């Protein structure tokens, strides 16, 4: 009868992420639908070379679409065409180089689409399969939800913390008020 | 130093002149055909809509 | 029409003392960006002058940590929100300014009165609260300078409490680098943007770094 | 500070077979606890058993951490800070990465209880206080020891 | 002197300006640097699990107050909240760098002198 | 701590069955309950795996603590090898 | 287009031609409201009148009719959302600030409501009642329904029903005359274009008075519910209350017969089919009977069974609440039998995926509050898998 | 009276020494070993190493005075159909404690048998062991059962060394009020009860409205009583502490008895706040970092942002 | 855009900073000369050499002193000091503390 | 000594510097 | 007490001491809480009565009752769930107002006001 162990489920990693993300997009094959502890150990040794492909990948993507389709990505309100043509045709048309349509399209880009945009940094170099990770596929990186919902720790940040509440004890009487109220002591006016 | 300086040049250059997220699609009546439609692309309230571009007739009166 | 080109790529007011600017500097030949981007970083950051309050004198309080009748905040409460509101002048120089109002009410930094050289940012800011009829006069001192005040003592005047003033009035900056992608120079790409506090706008703070 | 060595959460690599070794310490021990119930084993073979499989389990655990850094993850910080002997030591991280083992009551003795948890992992309530015993004698020693 | 609740004491050596520490990929310099050797040594993992939370929870906007000893619900339970709280952060307000999938936890930082980033990501918070 | 000594566990480093001949070696008890066998001599145990077989070799005055024909995951103990305070246990 | 006609003639129709989105629709049909657990009983040991802090601990040591508490069917329509699934709610509210709110709490939750009804001349959750004393006792009498209790059967929204593939519905409206005869009219439709009846009783304070008058009004309503949920203390209250707990407290007289019967657990008690023959019915295509998290027995008419469960409220003691863990085990179980048929024909992935309404329940008694803590099915799903052995899950 | 902490966690302190105790002298270190029966009574973790190691420790959160003189820590008693059992919290004496089997582990396992039968590690007769369930006589539920108050203050506390968490305590009794408090963004949900009992904050012992509120009192009425609270602005504290009451009550709001009207220093809300929250990188910075070294930017200094005000008193 | 002060307002620098950058671009690349791309560069350059020639200049000569110890009688003042602003603190000016007797406390709202 | 060894700590060799199995500039000073 | 004050100002009353309350004369609205102690959602409703006493000191009056003691009580009221007050207007004419749930605290005092 198959016992409780607490270690029946394997541990959440990355690499299993990105193994499977990996295996999905072809530039890995694993023996199984899910990777074995060997292919993730494996996978640790040789991550910074399939890290490295990605990103030359998308260098000689950059080089082949252009400027403008590539970083069209990040610009959500962008609807002309951003081929090479279509970005020739309007410079023979308008006098707009490719840099002057560049610079426009940026002009459209939010904030929030920038921040995004700057794991292209020159600097960076932010894993392309990491930038284009579905929700899904990240939450597996630590296991998904929290079986204990995160809802009980979150607390807002401006509070007067209600000492009434189910969690607190009853307030403390004054020293001088419950020995006067259990005739303990006696006030002055008894006294005098 | 020039080099420096003609880096920092180009900042200063001009150029010539020519002369209700609380309200939902559920609450305004719209036909199931139209519904299904915008809650298959997550448009659950009205931003959603006005971000994505007789629907609008009934729409406009509400 | 110029090869090299610049413009504000997007120019947002989030509040009255919060603006913020983003800017796109393109093509770059490659480790210009990089120059450029660290170089931009530290004028904007330290080498932008900024002017506000540096002290304020009081009349009738004897010490900055005492309660005066009619307001609800406390001295040290004055003096934080005198340390707070923004102020911009191109001029250099100490200058004064005068507080001198009646209650009750609420005082803001519409209540000062500043001199021609100066003006005031953001005239909502809280400073004071009157809750009865009391004549109150502060004396400002107005100074532009770079960093922030030194907070070491300067009260031997006539019980001028000095404020200490941060002039810095980029809030925070950034760069990216971006390959243009051109394959045959390693052209570059850089955005530069920009949070100051209101004194002067991202594009004027671009040009003064 | 230009390579900017920094050790994070997931930098605490555990040996790939940690759960299957304490899975496997695990079953052995509840057969054992089992029979002991049943009479086939006496207290004493239970209490040899229990703190000997969670030793050999920890020490083998220690044992492979040094290889399994240097073959898997050879730039891990925190396996680089304690390798080059810049600071902390084999034993030290495997308190963080591997099980921080049996401790000792104040007498000498072996408490039963392991702690199959490390640092990163968290160890739970009874384990926290059991770990006491050894940071408690730790600090006393250390008095002693010094004077 | 300052010091962490985990125990990770400190004397001030040092103050800089703000353009040369180090800064984030939104352009923030940190306040503070702390020697990463003094974890492995001292143990005490808690002032991470505390510095990634404490990014997470001022960019969204919460506050969180943890009982001890959360991982008696499951394992990795701090882990799982902290990642999943950082993901938050960098989903809500778009900054990608504050959960990095490669390294979550790290994120690359720039040099404030040379403008340069450290090769190795480094671990941040609040 | 129990064993008197230094004891050195010998791991299976393949998975698979084990096959030798338990005649050669002589029943036991060991210090934990579990039966197993002590060896006096030279023996070599065969583990026949996926790829090959991976024939080991037990030294002499060893527990060995398993069985023929029996299946040992990787890294499991196969053999145990063996080359005064009193305390008083209350039940 | 008539929801007051019969559902016999013509559909409503409209213009729904390509497929419905997955996962299945899940309709909630009753009133709308925030906690407030019907099931109300007398309990013995109360803490402090006043003292509120002390009531905890009658969380973790509960009323066995309040181990799994239910409550209004927006819970359970709230709760199926966050397991995964859709549900739309049907009702009506007032026009005032609390029915916006209301419906704003279902919106936020991404529930339907466009099956929602506004009643601008009527109160949220407000009854106008007139006190009479009657025979020396005081009592009071329903002068004016609420907007809850006051759905007219014309305000049904077809386009839901016919979506819909589960319909829910609790006996709290069969205390509303109104409510009772819509109800009937919603579950006729929801039949016509093929949707399952789903019956959570969760018995509110008037029905427990009397077995007899209770199966009467429930008589109607139990014949056309193809999945009803029931509690064990509905359940025994429905068959005969004396009995079953004669059997509970039967301990034999000189020796156990079996060795089971000498460790004196807790009466997890399996009751036969044979015992389930009066409430049992021809459309009745699954029965669960709830001890609260901990047994899940099930029903159908080839086979039947339990599933065993856990509850840990004691693991965080000053955030336990049982509140909402009833609508989550029913939200669990509407979540899996949309999206796995093959549920009422066999027992093996029966069991399984009870268990998944089990691991709902148990997260569900960990949080303050019902729609506040109800859990992600993720987080459902890790608690499943951590919780049971591979082989269960 | 150096912060709200200190004020509190003083009042429980055990010595071992004093008049008729164990001094330094007479001192072995048995008494300075954590002993089984210390479990939810005296805090392991917290040595605090005053005159002697291991003779000046502190008592439980949850630890109560016995009538004989002893320490009670409460516990849930599993009761097995015996009667309701009306509170199944029990307070155990060290003497009972023994023999009673204690488990702290969770009822979250399930199998293709029941759950009695799973098996979790217990405590019997000053011994940990694996039991099942069925055989399990109490549990201990709360979780801050075995800790004092300077150990409990520490969020993520299981994933330090518990020697690391002896010195915590320590340091967070030599944290400084600052000038403008702010509350922790991760903690343990302690705080509350921290500043609630250290009577730093003002609290209303009269419930009613807030009828004035200033900088230096505020004035409630309630039940035809007015009550004039004053606040303390500015007083130095024994160890040469700013001791500053800032209103956290605005006027014409209502307030139930005990609830919060003002907060003292290193207060925010009703919080224990002894620090800031501020950005950190943990990376080597040129050897100014060294071992325990801090690199700090001058935005903590000209920001204010560990200023602290000090009276000091010359008499 | 400049730093031009009344003493370099004639722009004579950047004329003679501009040829000199055009010579120096002509003279090193004499077969370059029919080239549009070098003329580009070349006139780009000339700009900033001239730009540079205005700039040192406005440092050099600085600005004549304001309106309220030198052989040639030539005074001038630095940038910083002809951005200095006078102090406004005239005792009858509105910026400055007045006695009690006029101080006409302004009411607030 | 972290800095010295990260210096020293030369170039990944083997399977952990090529992805395939093969089956760089040169500096005068 | 005389030295210390009340920490609960809602009045816990029997089906019989409400009876007579009903029965006289009453000024102000009256406010009837019928909870259980081992209500889950009643420990947050009964958070807000005491709030709610404070707001109305003696403009209204705030009793509960208590449905372990009385279950035959409450049933007769036509208490269908725990979480349910009753506002019994101090005009004999009007229609006691029911609510179920936990109505927020703004709704309470609109209530008291608004239709008493
Ligand atoms: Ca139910
Ligand atoms: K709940």
Same mark, same amino acid.
């Given at each position: 009868?198959?016992?409780?162990?607490?270690?029946?489920?394997?541990?959440?990693?990355?690499?299993?992420?990105?193994?499977? %993300?990996?295996?999905?997009?072809?530039?890995?094959?694993?023996?199984?639908?899910?990777?074995?502890?060997?292919?993730?150990?494996?996978?640790?040794?040789?991550?910074?070379?399939?890290?490295?492909?990605?990103?030359?990948?998308?260098?000689?993507?950059?080089?082949?679409?252009?400027?403008?389709?590539?970083?069209?990505?990040?610009?959500?309100?962008?609807?002309?065409?951003?081929?090479?043509?279509?970005?020739?045709?309007?410079?023979?048309?308008?006098?707009?180089?490719?840099?002057?349509?560049?610079?426009?399209?940026?002009?459209?880009?939010?904030?929030?689409?920038?921040?995004?945009?700057?794991?292209?940094?020159?600097?960076?170099?932010?894993?392309?399969? %990491?930038?284009?990770?579905?929700?899904?596929?990240?939450?597996?990186?630590?296991?998904?939800?929290?079986?204990?919902?995160?809802?009980?720790?979150?607390?807002?940040?401006?509070?007067?913390?209600?000492?009434?509440?189910?969690?607190?004890?009853?307030?403390?009487?004054?020293?001088?008020?419950?020995?006067?109220?259990?005739?303990?002591?006696?006030?002055?006016?008894?006294?005098? | 130093?020039?080099?420096?300086?003609?880096?920092?040049?180009?900042?200063?250059?001009?150029?010539?002149?020519?002369?209700?997220?609380?309200?939902?699609?559920?609450?305004?009546?719209?036909?199931?055909?139209?519904?299904?439609?915008?809650?298959?692309?997550?448009?659950?309230?009205?931003?959603?809509?006005?971000?994505?571009?007789?629907?609008?007739?009934?729409?406009?009166?509400? | 029409?110029?090869?090299?080109?610049?413009?504000?790529?997007?120019?947002?007011?989030?509040?009255?003392?919060?603006?913020?600017?983003?800017?796109?500097?393109?093509?770059?030949?490659?480790?210009?960006?990089?120059?450029?981007?660290?170089?931009?970083?530290?004028?904007?950051?330290?080498?932008?002058?900024?002017?506000?309050?540096?002290?304020?004198?009081?009349?009738?309080?004897?010490?900055?940590?005492?309660?005066?009748?009619?307001?609800?905040?406390?001295?040290?409460?004055?003096?934080?929100?005198?340390?707070?509101?923004?102020?911009?002048?191109?001029?250099?120089?100490?200058?004064?300014?005068?507080?001198?109002?009646?209650?009750?009410?609420?005082?803001?930094?519409?209540?000062?009165?500043?001199?021609?050289?100066?003006?005031?940012?953001?005239?909502?800011?809280?400073?004071?609260?009157?809750?009865?009829?009391?004549?109150?006069?502060?004396?400002?001192?107005?100074?532009?300078?770079?960093?922030?005040?030194?907070?070491?003592?300067?009260?031997?005047?006539?019980?001028?409490?000095?404020?200490?003033?941060?002039?810095?009035?980029?809030?925070?900056?950034?760069?990216?680098?971006?390959?243009?992608?051109?394959?045959?120079?390693?052209?570059?790409?850089?955005?530069?943007?920009?949070?100051?506090?209101?004194?002067?706008?991202?594009?004027?703070?671009?040009?003064?770094? | 500070?230009?390579?900017?060595?920094?050790?994070?959460?997931?930098?605490?690599?555990?040996?790939?077979?940690?759960?299957?070794?304490?899975?496997?310490?695990?079953?052995?021990?509840?057969?054992?606890?089992?029979?002991?119930?049943?009479?086939?084993?006496?207290?004493?073979?239970?209490?040899?058993?229990?703190?000997?499989?969670?030793?050999?389990?920890?020490?083998?655990?220690?044992?492979?951490?040094?290889?399994?850094?240097?073959?898997?993850?050879?730039?891990?910080?925190?396996?680089?800070?304690?390798?080059?002997?810049?600071?902390?030591?084999?034993?030290?991280?495997?308190?963080?990465?591997?099980?921080?083992?049996?401790?000792?009551?104040?007498?000498?003795?072996?408490?039963?209880?392991?702690?199959?948890?490390?640092?990163?992992?968290?160890?739970?309530?009874?384990?926290?206080?059991?770990?006491?015993?050894?940071?408690?004698?730790?600090?006393?020693?250390?008095?002693?020891?010094?004077? | 002197?300052?010091?962490?609740?985990?125990?990770?004491?400190?004397?001030?050596?040092?103050?800089?300006?703000?353009?040369?520490?180090?800064?984030?990929?939104?352009?923030?310099?940190?306040?503070?640097?702390?020697?990463?050797?003094?974890?492995?040594?001292?143990?005490?993992?808690?002032?991470?699990?505390?510095?990634?939370?404490?990014?997470?929870?001022?960019?969204?906007?919460?506050?969180?107050?943890?009982?001890?000893?959360?991982?008696?619900?499951?394992?990795?339970?701090?882990?799982?909240?902290?990642?999943?709280?950082?993901?938050?952060?960098?989903?809500?307000?778009?900054?990608?760098?504050?959960?990095?999938?490669?390294?979550?936890?790290?994120?690359?930082?720039?040099?404030?002198?040379?403008?340069?980033?450290?090769?190795?990501?480094?671990?941040?918070?609040? | 701590?129990?064993?008197?000594?230094?004891?050195?566990?010998?791991?299976?480093?393949?998975?698979?069955?084990?096959?030798?001949?338990?005649?050669?070696?002589?029943?036991?008890?060991?210090?934990?309950?579990?039966?197993?066998?002590?060896?006096?001599?030279?023996?070599?145990?065969?583990?026949?795996?996926?790829?090959?077989?991976?024939?080991?070799?037990?030294?002499?005055?060893?527990?060995?603590?398993?069985?023929?024909?029996?299946?040992?995951?990787?890294?499991?103990?196969?053999?145990?090898?063996?080359?005064?305070?009193?305390?008083?246990?209350?039940? | 287009?008539?929801?007051?006609?019969?559902?016999?003639?013509?559909?409503?129709?409209?213009?729904?031609?390509?497929?419905?989105?997955?996962?299945?629709?899940?309709?909630?049909?009753?009133?709308?409201?925030?906690?407030?657990?019907?099931?109300?009983?007398?309990?013995?040991?109360?803490?402090?009148?006043?003292?509120?802090?002390?009531?905890?601990?009658?969380?973790?040591?509960?009323?066995?009719?309040?181990?799994?508490?239910?409550?209004?069917?927006?819970?359970?329509?709230?709760?199926?959302?966050?397991?995964?699934?859709?549900?739309?709610?049907?009702?009506?509210?007032?026009?005032?600030?609390?029915?916006?709110?209301?419906?704003?709490?279902?919106?936020?939750?991404?529930?339907?409501?466009?099956?929602?009804?506004?009643?601008?001349?009527?109160?949220?959750?407000?009854?106008?009642?007139?006190?009479?004393?009657?025979?020396?006792?005081?009592?009071?009498?329903?002068?004016?329904?609420?907007?809850?209790?006051?759905?007219?059967?014309?305000?049904?929204?077809?386009?839901?029903?016919?979506?819909?593939?589960?319909?829910?519905?609790?006996?709290?409206?069969?205390?509303?005359?109104?409510?009772?005869?819509?109800?009937?009219?919603?579950?006729?439709?929801?039949?016509?274009?093929?949707?399952?009846?789903?019956?959570?009783?969760?018995?509110?304070?008037?029905?427990?008075?009397?077995?007899?008058?209770?199966?009467?009004?429930?008589?109607?309503?139990?014949?056309?519910?193809?999945?009803?949920?029931?509690?064990?203390?509905?359940?025994?209250?429905?068959?005969?209350?004396?009995?079953?707990?004669?059997?509970?407290?039967?301990?034999?007289?000189?020796?156990?017969?079996?060795?089971?019967?000498?460790?004196?657990?807790?009466?997890?008690?399996?009751?036969?089919?044979?015992?389930?023959?009066?409430?049992?019915?021809?459309?009745?295509?699954?029965?669960?009977?709830?001890?609260?998290?901990?047994?899940?027995?099930?029903?159908?008419?080839?086979?039947?069974?339990?599933?065993?469960?856990?509850?840990?409220?004691?693991?965080?003691?000053?955030?336990?609440?049982?509140?909402?863990?009833?609508?989550?085990?029913?939200?669990?179980?509407?979540?899996?039998?949309?999206?796995?048929?093959?549920?009422?024909?066999?027992?093996?992935?029966?069991?399984?995926?009870?268990?998944?309404?089990?691991?709902?329940?148990?997260?569900?008694?960990?949080?303050?509050?019902?729609?506040?803590?109800?859990?992600?099915?993720?987080?459902?799903?890790?608690?499943?898998?951590?919780?049971?052995?591979?082989?269960?899950? | 009276?150096?912060?709200?902490?200190?004020?509190?966690?003083?009042?429980?302190?055990?010595?071992?020494?004093?008049?008729?105790?164990?001094?330094?002298?007479?001192?072995?270190?048995?008494?300075?070993?954590?002993?089984?029966?210390?479990?939810?009574?005296?805090?392991?973790?917290?040595?605090?190493?005053?005159?002697?190691?291991?003779?000046?420790?502190?008592?439980?959160?949850?630890?109560?005075?016995?009538?004989?003189?002893?320490?009670?820590?409460?516990?849930?008693?599993?009761?097995?159909?015996?009667?309701?059992?009306?509170?199944?919290?029990?307070?155990?004496?060290?003497?009972?404690?023994?023999?009673?089997?204690?488990?702290?582990?969770?009822?979250?396992?399930?199998?293709?048998?029941?759950?009695?039968?799973?098996?979790?590690?217990?405590?019997?007769?000053?011994?940990?062991?694996?039991?099942?369930?069925?055989?399990?006589?109490?549990?201990?539920?709360?979780?801050?059962?075995?800790?004092?108050?300077?150990?409990?203050?520490?969020?993520?506390?299981?994933?330090?060394?518990?020697?690391?968490?002896?010195?915590?305590?320590?340091?967070?009794?030599?944290?400084?009020?600052?000038?403008?408090?702010?509350?922790?963004?991760?903690?343990?949900?302690?705080?509350?009860?921290?500043?609630?009992?250290?009577?730093?904050?003002?609290?209303?012992?009269?419930?009613?409205?807030?009828?004035?509120?200033?900088?230096?009192?505020?004035?409630?009425?309630?039940?035809?009583?007015?009550?004039?609270?004053?606040?303390?602005?500015?007083?130095?504290?024994?160890?040469?502490?700013?001791?500053?009451?800032?209103?956290?009550?605005?006027?014409?709001?209502?307030?139930?008895?005990?609830?919060?009207?003002?907060?003292?220093?290193?207060?925010?809300?009703?919080?224990?706040?002894?620090?800031?929250?501020?950005?950190?990188?943990?990376?080597?910075?040129?050897?100014?970092?060294?071992?325990?070294?801090?690199?700090?930017?001058?935005?903590?200094?000209?920001?204010?942002?560990?200023?602290?005000?000090?009276?000091?008193?010359?008499? | 855009?400049?730093?031009?002060?009344?003493?370099?307002?004639?722009?004579?620098?950047?004329?003679?900073?501009?040829?000199?950058?055009?010579?120096?671009?002509?003279?090193?690349?004499?077969?370059?000369?029919?080239?549009?791309?070098?003329?580009?560069?070349?006139?780009?350059?000339?700009?900033?050499?001239?730009?540079?020639?205005?700039?040192?200049?406005?440092?050099?000569?600085?600005?004549?002193?304001?309106?309220?110890?030198?052989?040639?009688?030539?005074?001038?003042?630095?940038?910083?000091?002809?951005?200095?602003?006078?102090?406004?603190?005239?005792?009858?000016?509105?910026?400055?503390?007045?006695?009690?007797?006029?101080?006409?406390?302004?009411?607030?709202? | 000594?972290?800095?010295?060894?990260?210096?020293?700590?030369?170039?990944?060799?083997?399977?952990?510097?090529?992805?395939?199995?093969?089956?760089?500039?040169?500096?005068?000073? | 007490?005389?030295?210390?004050?009340?920490?609960?100002?809602?009045?816990?009353?029997?089906?019989?001491?409400?009876?007579?309350?009903?029965?006289?004369?009453?000024?102000?609205?009256?406010?009837?809480?019928?909870?259980?102690?081992?209500?889950?959602?009643?420990?947050?409703?009964?958070?807000?009565?005491?709030?709610?006493?404070?707001?109305?000191?003696?403009?209204?009056?705030?009793?509960?009752?208590?449905?372990?003691?009385?279950?035959?009580?409450?049933?007769?009221?036509?208490?269908?769930?725990?979480?349910?007050?009753?506002?019994?207007?101090?005009?004999?004419?009007?229609?006691?107002?029911?609510?179920?749930?936990?109505?927020?605290?703004?709704?309470?005092?609109?209530?008291?006001?608004?239709?008493?």
């Amino acid at each position: 009868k198959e016992q409780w162990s607490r270690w029946q489920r394997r541990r959440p990693d990355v690499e299993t992420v990105f193994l499977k %993300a990996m295996a999905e997009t072809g530039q890995v094959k694993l023996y199984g639908k899910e990777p074995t502890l060997t292919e993730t150990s494996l996978y640790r040794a040789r991550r910074h070379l399939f890290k490295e492909e990605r990103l030359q990948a998308e260098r000689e993507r950059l080089a082949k679409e252009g400027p403008m389709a590539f970083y069209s990505e990040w610009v959500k309100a962008w609807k002309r065409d951003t081929s090479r043509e279509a970005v020739q045709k309007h410079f023979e048309e308008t006098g707009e180089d490719e840099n002057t349509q560049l610079i426009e399209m940026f002009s459209h880009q939010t904030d929030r689409e920038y921040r995004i945009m700057m794991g292209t940094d020159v600097r960076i170099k932010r894993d392309p399969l %990491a930038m284009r990770m579905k929700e899904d596929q990240i939450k597996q990186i630590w296991g998904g939800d929290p079986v204990y919902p995160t809802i009980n720790y979150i607390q807002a940040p401006d509070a007067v913390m209600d000492f009434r509440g189910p969690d607190f004890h009853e307030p403390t009487p004054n020293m001088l008020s419950y020995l006067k109220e259990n005739c303990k002591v006696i006030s002055r006016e008894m006294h005098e | 130093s020039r080099n420096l300086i003609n880096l920092f040049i180009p900042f200063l250059h001009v150029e010539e002149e020519t002369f209700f997220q609380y309200i939902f699609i559920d609450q305004l009546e719209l036909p199931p055909r139209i519904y299904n439609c915008l809650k298959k692309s997550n448009i659950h309230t009205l931003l959603d809509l006005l971000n994505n571009s007789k629907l609008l007739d009934i729409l406009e009166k509400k | 029409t110029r090869t090299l080109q610049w413009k504000c790529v997007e120019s947002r007011r989030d509040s009255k003392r919060l603006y913020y600017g983003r800017f796109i500097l393109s093509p770059l030949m490659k480790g210009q960006a990089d120059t450029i981007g660290i170089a931009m970083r530290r004028a904007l950051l330290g080498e932008i002058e900024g002017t506000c309050i540096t002290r304020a004198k009081f009349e009738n309080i004897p010490h900055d940590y005492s309660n005066i009748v009619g307001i609800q905040e406390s001295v040290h409460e004055i003096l934080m929100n005198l340390n707070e509101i923004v102020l911009k002048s191109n001029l250099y120089g100490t200058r004064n300014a005068l507080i001198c109002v009646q209650g009750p009410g609420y005082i803001t930094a519409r209540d000062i009165i500043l001199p021609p050289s100066v003006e005031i940012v953001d005239n909502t800011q809280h400073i004071a609260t009157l809750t009865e009829p009391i004549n109150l006069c502060i004396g400002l001192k107005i100074e532009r300078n770079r960093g922030y005040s030194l907070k070491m003592s300067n009260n031997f005047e006539d019980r001028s409490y000095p404020i200490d003033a941060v002039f810095m009035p980029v809030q925070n900056a950034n760069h990216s680098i971006h390959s243009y992608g051109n394959g045959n120079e390693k052209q570059e790409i850089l955005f530069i943007e920009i949070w100051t506090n209101g004194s002067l706008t991202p594009k004027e703070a671009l040009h003064e770094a | 500070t230009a390579t900017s060595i920094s050790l994070g959460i997931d930098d605490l690599l555990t040996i790939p077979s940690k759960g299957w070794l304490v899975q496997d310490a695990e079953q052995q021990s509840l057969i054992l606890e089992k029979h002991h119930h049943y009479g086939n084993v006496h207290a004493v073979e239970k209490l040899r058993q229990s703190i000997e499989i969670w030793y050999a389990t920890s020490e083998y655990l220690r044992q492979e951490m040094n290889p399994n850094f240097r073959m898997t993850d050879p730039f891990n910080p925190v396996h680089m800070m304690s390798f080059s002997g810049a600071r902390g030591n084999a034993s030290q991280v495997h308190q963080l990465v591997g099980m921080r083992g049996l401790m000792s009551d104040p007498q000498g003795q072996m408490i039963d209880l392991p702690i199959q948890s490390n640092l990163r992992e968290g160890l739970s309530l009874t384990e926290y206080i059991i770990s006491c015993y050894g940071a408690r004698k730790g600090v006393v020693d250390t008095a002693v020891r010094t004077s | 002197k300052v010091a962490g609740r985990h125990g990770n004491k400190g004397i001030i050596s040092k103050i800089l300006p703000r353009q040369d520490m180090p800064y984030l990929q939104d352009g923030r310099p940190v306040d503070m640097v702390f020697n990463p050797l003094g974890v492995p040594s001292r143990m005490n993992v808690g002032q991470i699990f505390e510095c990634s939370l404490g990014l997470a929870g001022s960019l969204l906007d919460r506050h969180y107050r943890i009982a001890p000893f959360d991982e008696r619900y499951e394992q990795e339970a701090s882990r799982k909240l902290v990642f999943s709280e950082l993901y938050e952060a960098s989903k809500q307000t778009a900054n990608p760098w504050v959960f990095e999938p490669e390294y979550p936890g790290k994120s690359r930082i720039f040099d404030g002198r040379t403008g340069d980033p450290f090769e190795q990501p480094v671990i941040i918070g609040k | 701590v129990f064993t008197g000594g230094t004891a050195e566990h010998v791991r299976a480093p393949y998975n698979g069955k084990i096959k030798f001949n338990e005649d050669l070696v002589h029943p036991t008890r060991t210090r934990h309950g579990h039966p197993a066998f002590l060896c006096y001599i030279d023996l070599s145990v065969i583990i026949e795996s996926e790829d090959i077989i991976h024939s080991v070799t037990i030294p002499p005055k060893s527990f060995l603590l398993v069985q023929n024909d029996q299946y040992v995951e990787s890294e499991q103990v196969i053999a145990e090898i063996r080359e005064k305070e009193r305390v008083r246990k209350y039940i | 287009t008539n929801p007051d006609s019969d559902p016999a003639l013509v559909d409503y129709d409209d213009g729904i031609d390509f497929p419905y989105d997955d996962p299945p629709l899940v309709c909630c049909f009753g009133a709308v409201q925030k906690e407030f657990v019907p099931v109300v009983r007398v309990h013995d040991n109360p803490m402090h009148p006043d003292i509120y802090s002390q009531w905890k601990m009658l969380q973790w040591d509960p009323p066995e009719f309040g181990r799994a508490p239910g409550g209004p069917p927006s819970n359970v329509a709230i709760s199926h959302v966050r397991l995964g699934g859709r549900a739309a709610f049907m009702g009506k509210v007032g026009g005032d600030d609390y029915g916006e709110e209301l419906v704003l709490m279902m919106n936020k939750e991404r529930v339907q409501t466009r099956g929602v009804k506004f009643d601008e001349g009527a109160s949220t959750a407000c009854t106008r009642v007139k006190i009479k004393f009657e025979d020396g006792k005081m009592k009071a009498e329903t002068v004016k329904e609420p907007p809850e209790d006051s759905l007219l059967a014309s305000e049904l929204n077809l386009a839901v029903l016919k979506e819909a593939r589960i319909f829910h519905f609790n006996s709290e409206v069969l205390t509303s005359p109104t409510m009772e005869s819509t109800l009937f009219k919603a579950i006729q439709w929801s039949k016509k274009f093929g949707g399952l009846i789903f019956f959570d009783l969760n018995l509110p304070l008037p029905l427990w008075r009397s077995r007899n008058e209770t199966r009467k009004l429930i008589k109607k309503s139990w014949d056309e519910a193809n999945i009803i949920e029931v509690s064990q203390q509905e359940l025994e209250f429905l068959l005969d209350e004396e009995y079953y707990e004669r059997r509970r407290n039967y301990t034999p007289q000189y020796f156990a017969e079996d060795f089971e019967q000498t460790k004196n657990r807790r009466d997890y008690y399996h009751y036969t089919p044979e015992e389930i023959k009066p409430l049992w019915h021809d459309d009745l295509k699954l029965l669960v009977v709830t001890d609260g998290t901990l047994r899940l027995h099930y029903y159908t008419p080839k086979f039947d069974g339990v599933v065993v469960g856990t509850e840990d409220v004691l693991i965080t003691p000053f955030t336990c609440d049982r509140t909402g863990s009833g609508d989550a085990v029913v939200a669990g179980i509407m979540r899996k039998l949309t999206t796995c048929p093959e549920m009422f024909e066999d027992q093996d992935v029966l069991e399984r995926q009870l268990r998944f309404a089990v691991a709902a329940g148990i997260i569900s008694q960990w949080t303050i509050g019902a729609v506040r803590g109800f859990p992600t099915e993720s987080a459902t799903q890790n608690l499943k898998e951590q919780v049971y052995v591979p082989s269960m899950w | 009276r150096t912060n709200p902490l200190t004020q509190i966690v003083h009042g429980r302190k055990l010595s071992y020494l004093g008049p008729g105790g164990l001094t330094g002298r007479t001192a072995n270190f048995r008494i300075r070993d954590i002993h089984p029966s210390h479990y939810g009574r005296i805090c392991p973790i917290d040595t605090s190493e005053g005159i002697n190691v291991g003779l000046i420790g502190s008592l439980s959160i949850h630890a109560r005075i016995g009538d004989w003189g002893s320490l009670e820590s409460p516990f849930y008693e599993l009761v097995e159909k015996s009667k309701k059992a009306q509170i199944r919290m029990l307070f155990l004496s060290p003497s009972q404690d023994e023999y009673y089997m204690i488990a702290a582990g969770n009822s979250l396992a399930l199998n293709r048998g029941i759950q009695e039968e799973q098996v979790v590690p217990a405590r019997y007769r000053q011994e940990f062991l694996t039991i099942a369930w069925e055989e399990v006589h109490l549990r201990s539920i709360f979780p801050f059962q075995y800790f004092s108050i300077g150990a409990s203050l520490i969020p993520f506390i299981e994933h330090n060394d518990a020697n690391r968490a002896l010195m915590s305590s320590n340091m967070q009794r030599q944290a400084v009020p600052l000038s403008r408090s702010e509350k922790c963004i991760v903690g343990t949900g302690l705080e509350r009860q921290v500043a609630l009992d250290s009577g730093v904050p003002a609290i209303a012992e009269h419930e009613g409205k807030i009828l004035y509120t200033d900088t230096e009192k505020i004035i409630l009425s309630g039940n035809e009583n007015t009550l004039s609270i004053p606040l303390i602005m500015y007083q130095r504290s024994n160890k040469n502490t700013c001791m500053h009451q800032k209103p956290q009550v605005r006027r014409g709001k209502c307030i139930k008895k005990g609830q919060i009207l003002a907060d003292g220093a290193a207060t925010v809300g009703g919080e224990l706040a002894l620090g800031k929250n501020i950005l950190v990188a943990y990376m080597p910075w040129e050897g100014y970092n060294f071992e325990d070294a801090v690199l700090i930017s001058e935005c903590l200094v000209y920001g204010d942002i560990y200023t602290s005000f000090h009276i000091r008193k010359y008499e | 855009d400049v730093p031009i002060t009344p003493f370099t307002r004639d722009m004579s620098a950047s004329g003679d900073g501009i040829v000199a950058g055009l010579i120096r671009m002509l003279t090193v690349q004499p077969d370059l000369m029919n080239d549009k791309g070098y003329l580009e560069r070349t006139a780009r350059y000339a700009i900033e050499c001239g730009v540079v020639d205005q700039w040192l200049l406005a440092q050099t000569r600085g600005y004549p002193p304001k309106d309220d110890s030198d052989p040639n009688g030539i005074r001038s003042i630095t940038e910083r000091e002809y951005r200095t602003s006078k102090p406004y603190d005239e005792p009858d000016g509105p910026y400055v503390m007045k006695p009690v007797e006029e101080r006409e406390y302004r009411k607030l709202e | 000594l972290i800095g010295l060894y990260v210096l020293t700590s030369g170039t990944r060799r083997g399977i952990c510097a090529n992805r395939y199995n093969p089956c760089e500039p040169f500096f005068c000073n | 007490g005389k030295f210390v004050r009340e920490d609960y100002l809602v009045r816990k009353l029997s089906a019989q001491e409400l009876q007579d309350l009903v029965k006289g004369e009453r000024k102000v609205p009256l406010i009837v809480d019928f909870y259980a102690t081992w209500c889950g959602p009643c420990i947050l409703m009964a958070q807000e009565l005491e709030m709610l006493a404070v707001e109305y000191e003696s403009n209204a009056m705030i009793v509960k009752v208590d449905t372990d003691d009385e279950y035959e009580f409450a049933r007769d009221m036509q208490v269908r769930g725990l979480p349910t007050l009753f506002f019994i207007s101090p005009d004999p004419s009007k229609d006691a107002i029911r609510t179920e749930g936990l109505i927020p605290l703004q709704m309470m005092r609109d209530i008291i006001d608004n239709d008493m």
